[PDB]
Design a protein around this ligand. Structure first.
Ligand code: GAL
Ligand code: GAL
Ligand code: GAL
Ligand code: GAL
Lengths: 141, 141
Protein backbone atom coordinates (compact mmCIF):
# COMPACT_ATOMS: atom_id res chain seq x y z
CA UNK A 1 0.00 0.00 0.00
CA UNK A 2 1.92 2.93 -1.51
CA UNK A 3 2.34 6.62 -0.44
CA UNK A 4 2.25 9.15 -3.35
CA UNK A 5 5.70 9.91 -4.94
CA UNK A 6 6.93 12.64 -4.87
CA UNK A 7 6.22 12.35 -1.10
CA UNK A 8 6.21 15.63 0.96
CA UNK A 9 5.80 15.65 4.83
CA UNK A 10 6.33 18.66 7.17
CA UNK A 11 8.99 17.68 9.75
CA UNK A 12 11.14 18.94 12.68
CA UNK A 13 14.59 17.42 13.48
CA UNK A 14 17.06 17.63 16.39
CA UNK A 15 19.75 15.32 17.94
CA UNK A 16 18.10 11.85 18.28
CA UNK A 17 15.47 12.25 15.46
CA UNK A 18 15.32 9.36 12.90
CA UNK A 19 13.77 9.49 9.36
CA UNK A 20 12.86 5.90 8.27
CA UNK A 21 11.86 5.14 4.65
CA UNK A 22 10.80 1.76 3.18
CA UNK A 23 10.59 1.51 -0.62
CA UNK A 24 11.55 -0.31 -3.83
CA UNK A 25 13.29 0.90 -7.03
CA UNK A 26 10.71 1.03 -9.90
CA UNK A 27 13.12 -0.58 -12.49
CA UNK A 28 16.27 -2.81 -12.57
CA UNK A 29 19.70 -1.28 -11.66
CA UNK A 30 20.94 -1.64 -15.32
CA UNK A 31 18.56 1.33 -16.10
CA UNK A 32 20.03 3.44 -13.16
CA UNK A 33 16.85 4.48 -11.31
CA UNK A 34 17.44 7.33 -8.77
CA UNK A 35 16.26 7.91 -5.18
CA UNK A 36 16.43 11.45 -3.71
CA UNK A 37 15.70 12.52 -0.09
CA UNK A 38 15.85 16.33 0.59
CA UNK A 39 15.65 18.04 4.03
CA UNK A 40 14.17 21.51 3.19
CA UNK A 41 14.12 24.81 5.23
CA UNK A 42 10.46 25.54 4.06
CA UNK A 43 7.35 23.64 2.78
CA UNK A 44 8.15 25.12 -0.71
CA UNK A 45 10.20 22.65 -2.86
CA UNK A 46 12.31 25.63 -4.25
CA UNK A 47 13.48 26.29 -0.60
CA UNK A 48 17.06 25.59 0.58
CA UNK A 49 18.26 22.01 1.34
CA UNK A 50 20.12 21.32 4.64
CA UNK A 51 20.73 17.68 3.50
CA UNK A 52 20.46 16.35 -0.11
CA UNK A 53 20.84 12.52 -0.48
CA UNK A 54 20.77 11.17 -4.08
CA UNK A 55 21.24 7.44 -4.98
CA UNK A 56 22.03 6.39 -8.55
CA UNK A 57 21.16 2.69 -7.86
CA UNK A 58 24.09 0.38 -8.78
CA UNK A 59 26.53 3.32 -9.43
CA UNK A 60 27.04 5.93 -6.63
CA UNK A 61 25.63 8.32 -3.94
CA UNK A 62 26.08 12.13 -3.83
CA UNK A 63 25.30 14.36 -0.83
CA UNK A 64 25.23 18.20 -0.78
CA UNK A 65 23.43 21.26 0.65
CA UNK A 66 21.64 24.05 -1.34
CA UNK A 67 22.21 27.35 0.53
CA UNK A 68 20.51 30.62 -0.64
CA UNK A 69 19.75 28.85 -3.97
CA UNK A 70 23.36 27.58 -4.63
CA UNK A 71 24.69 23.97 -4.36
CA UNK A 72 27.79 23.76 -2.08
CA UNK A 73 30.62 21.12 -1.97
CA UNK A 74 29.39 17.74 -3.36
CA UNK A 75 30.36 14.59 -1.36
CA UNK A 76 30.49 11.33 -3.45
CA UNK A 77 30.42 7.65 -2.28
CA UNK A 78 30.83 4.48 -4.43
CA UNK A 79 29.38 2.48 -1.43
CA UNK A 80 26.30 0.59 -2.82
CA UNK A 81 24.58 -1.62 -0.19
CA UNK A 82 21.23 -1.42 -2.12
CA UNK A 83 20.31 -4.78 -3.81
CA UNK A 84 18.94 -4.98 -7.45
CA UNK A 85 15.14 -5.62 -7.42
CA UNK A 86 14.82 -5.53 -3.56
CA UNK A 87 12.76 -3.44 -1.13
CA UNK A 88 15.20 -1.34 1.04
CA UNK A 89 14.91 0.19 4.53
CA UNK A 90 16.75 3.55 4.77
CA UNK A 91 17.05 5.31 8.20
CA UNK A 92 18.64 8.80 8.55
CA UNK A 93 19.61 9.61 12.21
CA UNK A 94 20.49 13.13 13.49
CA UNK A 95 23.72 12.68 15.55
CA UNK A 96 25.17 15.75 17.33
CA UNK A 97 27.72 16.51 14.50
CA UNK A 98 26.31 14.66 11.42
CA UNK A 99 23.55 12.64 9.69
CA UNK A 100 24.06 8.84 9.77
CA UNK A 101 22.45 6.88 6.88
CA UNK A 102 21.68 3.15 7.58
CA UNK A 103 20.66 0.91 4.63
CA UNK A 104 19.03 -2.42 5.74
CA UNK A 105 20.57 -2.03 9.25
CA UNK A 106 24.17 -1.24 8.00
CA UNK A 107 25.90 2.21 8.43
CA UNK A 108 26.63 3.28 4.79
CA UNK A 109 27.00 7.14 4.62
CA UNK A 110 27.51 10.09 7.01
CA UNK A 111 27.40 13.89 6.34
CA UNK A 112 28.53 16.56 8.86
CA UNK A 113 25.91 19.28 9.64
CA UNK A 114 26.50 22.41 7.52
CA UNK A 115 23.26 23.98 8.93
CA UNK A 116 21.61 23.23 12.33
CA UNK A 117 19.04 20.41 11.79
CA UNK A 118 16.54 22.72 13.63
CA UNK A 119 16.36 24.69 10.28
CA UNK A 120 14.50 21.68 8.65
CA UNK A 121 10.71 22.20 8.12
CA UNK A 122 10.05 19.60 5.34
CA UNK A 123 11.29 16.25 3.92
CA UNK A 124 10.74 15.31 0.23
CA UNK A 125 11.29 11.69 -1.05
CA UNK A 126 11.13 11.40 -4.88
CA UNK A 127 12.58 9.99 -8.19
CA UNK A 128 12.33 6.34 -9.32
CA UNK A 129 10.88 4.44 -6.28
CA UNK A 130 7.64 3.12 -4.78
CA UNK A 131 7.24 4.10 -1.09
CA UNK A 132 5.46 1.83 1.49
CA UNK A 133 6.65 3.61 4.76
CA UNK A 134 7.76 7.14 5.84
CA UNK A 135 8.25 8.04 9.59
CA UNK A 136 9.98 10.83 11.57
CA UNK A 137 10.48 9.99 15.31
CA UNK A 138 9.57 12.87 17.78
CA UNK A 139 10.07 11.17 21.25
CA UNK A 140 13.04 13.38 22.40
CA UNK A 141 13.09 16.81 24.18
CA UNK B 1 -6.01 12.44 -17.27
CA UNK B 2 -2.63 10.77 -16.70
CA UNK B 3 -1.02 7.56 -18.13
CA UNK B 4 0.97 5.48 -15.56
CA UNK B 5 4.71 6.44 -15.24
CA UNK B 6 6.91 4.52 -15.91
CA UNK B 7 4.96 4.17 -19.21
CA UNK B 8 5.72 1.07 -21.41
CA UNK B 9 4.13 0.59 -24.92
CA UNK B 10 5.12 -2.07 -27.53
CA UNK B 11 6.09 -0.22 -30.75
CA UNK B 12 7.49 -0.63 -34.31
CA UNK B 13 9.46 2.17 -36.07
CA UNK B 14 10.68 2.83 -39.64
CA UNK B 15 11.41 5.97 -41.78
CA UNK B 16 8.40 8.33 -41.31
CA UNK B 17 7.29 7.04 -37.82
CA UNK B 18 6.73 9.76 -35.14
CA UNK B 19 6.64 9.23 -31.31
CA UNK B 20 4.66 12.14 -29.71
CA UNK B 21 4.66 12.66 -25.91
CA UNK B 22 2.77 15.34 -23.91
CA UNK B 23 3.73 15.76 -20.25
CA UNK B 24 4.78 18.06 -17.39
CA UNK B 25 7.81 17.99 -15.04
CA UNK B 26 6.64 16.96 -11.50
CA UNK B 27 8.80 19.66 -9.73
CA UNK B 28 10.48 23.05 -10.50
CA UNK B 29 13.73 23.11 -12.59
CA UNK B 30 15.80 24.25 -9.52
CA UNK B 31 15.36 20.61 -8.23
CA UNK B 32 16.56 19.14 -11.65
CA UNK B 33 13.75 16.67 -12.44
CA UNK B 34 14.66 14.17 -15.24
CA UNK B 35 12.76 12.87 -18.29
CA UNK B 36 13.97 9.66 -20.00
CA UNK B 37 12.65 8.10 -23.26
CA UNK B 38 14.23 4.70 -24.25
CA UNK B 39 13.68 2.81 -27.56
CA UNK B 40 14.24 -0.88 -26.55
CA UNK B 41 14.98 -4.02 -28.71
CA UNK B 42 12.61 -6.18 -26.48
CA UNK B 43 9.59 -5.74 -24.12
CA UNK B 44 12.04 -6.45 -21.20
CA UNK B 45 13.38 -3.17 -19.65
CA UNK B 46 16.90 -4.81 -19.25
CA UNK B 47 16.99 -5.17 -23.12
CA UNK B 48 19.30 -3.07 -25.35
CA UNK B 49 18.49 0.60 -26.17
CA UNK B 50 18.67 1.78 -29.84
CA UNK B 51 17.96 5.40 -28.68
CA UNK B 52 18.33 6.75 -25.09
CA UNK B 53 17.09 10.38 -24.57
CA UNK B 54 17.61 11.83 -21.04
CA UNK B 55 16.67 15.45 -20.06
CA UNK B 56 18.03 17.01 -16.87
CA UNK B 57 15.46 19.89 -16.95
CA UNK B 58 17.20 23.32 -16.86
CA UNK B 59 20.74 21.79 -17.27
CA UNK B 60 21.41 19.47 -20.28
CA UNK B 61 20.39 16.51 -22.53
CA UNK B 62 22.41 13.27 -23.08
CA UNK B 63 21.75 10.71 -25.83
CA UNK B 64 23.36 7.23 -26.15
CA UNK B 65 22.71 3.59 -27.15
CA UNK B 66 23.09 0.46 -24.90
CA UNK B 67 24.40 -2.39 -27.11
CA UNK B 68 24.78 -5.97 -25.71
CA UNK B 69 24.45 -4.46 -22.19
CA UNK B 70 27.14 -1.69 -22.64
CA UNK B 71 26.59 2.10 -23.05
CA UNK B 72 28.35 3.47 -26.18
CA UNK B 73 29.54 7.06 -27.01
CA UNK B 74 27.48 9.67 -25.04
CA UNK B 75 26.27 12.75 -26.99
CA UNK B 76 25.63 15.89 -24.82
CA UNK B 77 23.58 19.07 -25.61
CA UNK B 78 23.23 22.25 -23.47
CA UNK B 79 20.17 23.18 -25.67
CA UNK B 80 17.21 23.63 -23.21
CA UNK B 81 13.94 24.66 -24.96
CA UNK B 82 11.85 23.16 -22.07
CA UNK B 83 10.16 25.90 -19.92
CA UNK B 84 10.11 25.76 -16.03
CA UNK B 85 6.63 24.67 -14.76
CA UNK B 86 5.15 24.15 -18.31
CA UNK B 87 3.55 21.19 -20.10
CA UNK B 88 5.81 20.21 -23.09
CA UNK B 89 5.10 18.44 -26.41
CA UNK B 90 8.03 16.21 -27.49
CA UNK B 91 7.94 14.50 -30.95
CA UNK B 92 10.68 12.05 -32.08
CA UNK B 93 10.66 11.46 -35.90
CA UNK B 94 12.52 8.60 -37.67
CA UNK B 95 14.37 10.25 -40.62
CA UNK B 96 16.35 8.00 -43.01
CA UNK B 97 19.74 8.65 -41.23
CA UNK B 98 18.75 9.93 -37.73
CA UNK B 99 16.11 10.67 -35.04
CA UNK B 100 14.85 14.29 -34.99
CA UNK B 101 13.58 15.56 -31.59
CA UNK B 102 11.08 18.51 -31.71
CA UNK B 103 10.20 20.30 -28.42
CA UNK B 104 7.01 22.49 -28.68
CA UNK B 105 7.34 22.54 -32.52
CA UNK B 106 11.11 23.50 -32.57
CA UNK B 107 13.93 21.14 -33.81
CA UNK B 108 16.19 20.78 -30.70
CA UNK B 109 18.24 17.49 -30.95
CA UNK B 110 19.19 14.89 -33.61
CA UNK B 111 20.98 11.49 -33.23
CA UNK B 112 22.27 9.40 -36.18
CA UNK B 113 21.01 5.75 -36.28
CA UNK B 114 23.56 3.37 -34.71
CA UNK B 115 21.08 0.44 -35.11
CA UNK B 116 18.26 0.12 -37.72
CA UNK B 117 15.05 1.57 -36.16
CA UNK B 118 13.36 -1.74 -37.26
CA UNK B 119 15.16 -3.32 -34.20
CA UNK B 120 12.82 -1.31 -31.82
CA UNK B 121 10.04 -3.40 -30.13
CA UNK B 122 9.25 -1.14 -27.10
CA UNK B 123 9.29 2.51 -25.90
CA UNK B 124 9.61 3.41 -22.17
CA UNK B 125 8.90 6.99 -20.85
CA UNK B 126 9.89 7.47 -17.17
CA UNK B 127 11.56 9.63 -14.42
CA UNK B 128 10.12 12.87 -12.99
CA UNK B 129 7.09 13.71 -15.24
CA UNK B 130 3.31 13.35 -15.49
CA UNK B 131 2.21 12.02 -18.92
CA UNK B 132 -1.12 13.07 -20.60
CA UNK B 133 -0.41 11.74 -24.20
CA UNK B 134 1.71 8.98 -25.85
CA UNK B 135 1.30 8.10 -29.61
CA UNK B 136 3.33 6.21 -32.26
CA UNK B 137 2.17 6.88 -35.89
CA UNK B 138 1.85 3.72 -38.13
CA UNK B 139 0.41 5.19 -41.44
CA UNK B 140 3.49 4.42 -43.66
CA UNK B 141 4.46 1.24 -45.62
O1 GAL C 1 20.24 16.73 -8.07
C1 GAL C 1 20.82 17.91 -8.63
C2 GAL C 1 22.10 18.39 -7.91
O2 GAL C 1 22.80 17.36 -7.19
C3 GAL C 1 23.85 17.93 -6.40
O3 GAL C 1 24.57 16.93 -5.69
C4 GAL C 1 24.87 18.64 -7.28
O4 GAL C 1 25.80 19.27 -6.41
C5 GAL C 1 24.23 19.65 -8.21
O5 GAL C 1 25.12 20.03 -9.25
C6 GAL C 1 23.04 19.05 -8.91
O6 GAL C 1 23.58 18.10 -9.84
O1 GAL D 1 30.71 16.19 5.22
C1 GAL D 1 31.57 15.32 4.48
C2 GAL D 1 32.05 14.21 5.41
O2 GAL D 1 30.95 13.88 6.26
C3 GAL D 1 31.37 13.04 7.36
O3 GAL D 1 30.26 12.75 8.22
C4 GAL D 1 31.94 11.70 6.88
O4 GAL D 1 32.52 11.06 8.03
C5 GAL D 1 32.93 11.84 5.72
O5 GAL D 1 32.92 10.62 4.98
C6 GAL D 1 32.50 12.92 4.73
O6 GAL D 1 31.39 12.37 4.01
O1 GAL E 1 20.90 6.92 -17.54
C1 GAL E 1 22.09 6.17 -17.29
C2 GAL E 1 23.13 6.24 -18.42
O2 GAL E 1 23.03 7.41 -19.26
C3 GAL E 1 23.91 7.30 -20.39
O3 GAL E 1 23.84 8.46 -21.21
C4 GAL E 1 25.36 7.18 -19.94
O4 GAL E 1 26.13 6.95 -21.11
C5 GAL E 1 25.57 6.06 -18.93
O5 GAL E 1 26.82 6.19 -18.27
C6 GAL E 1 24.54 6.14 -17.84
O6 GAL E 1 24.87 7.30 -17.07
O1 GAL F 1 25.12 10.96 -33.43
C1 GAL F 1 25.70 12.18 -32.94
C2 GAL F 1 25.32 13.31 -33.90
O2 GAL F 1 23.97 13.06 -34.32
C3 GAL F 1 23.60 13.91 -35.42
O3 GAL F 1 22.26 13.62 -35.85
C4 GAL F 1 23.65 15.40 -35.05
O4 GAL F 1 23.47 16.13 -36.27
C5 GAL F 1 24.91 15.79 -34.29
O5 GAL F 1 24.61 16.94 -33.49
C6 GAL F 1 25.35 14.71 -33.29
O6 GAL F 1 24.41 14.77 -32.21
Amino acid sequence: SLLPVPYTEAASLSTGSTVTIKGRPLVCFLNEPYLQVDFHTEMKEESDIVFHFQVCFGRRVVMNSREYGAWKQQVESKNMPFQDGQEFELSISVLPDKYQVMVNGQSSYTFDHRIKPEAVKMVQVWRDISLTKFNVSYLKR
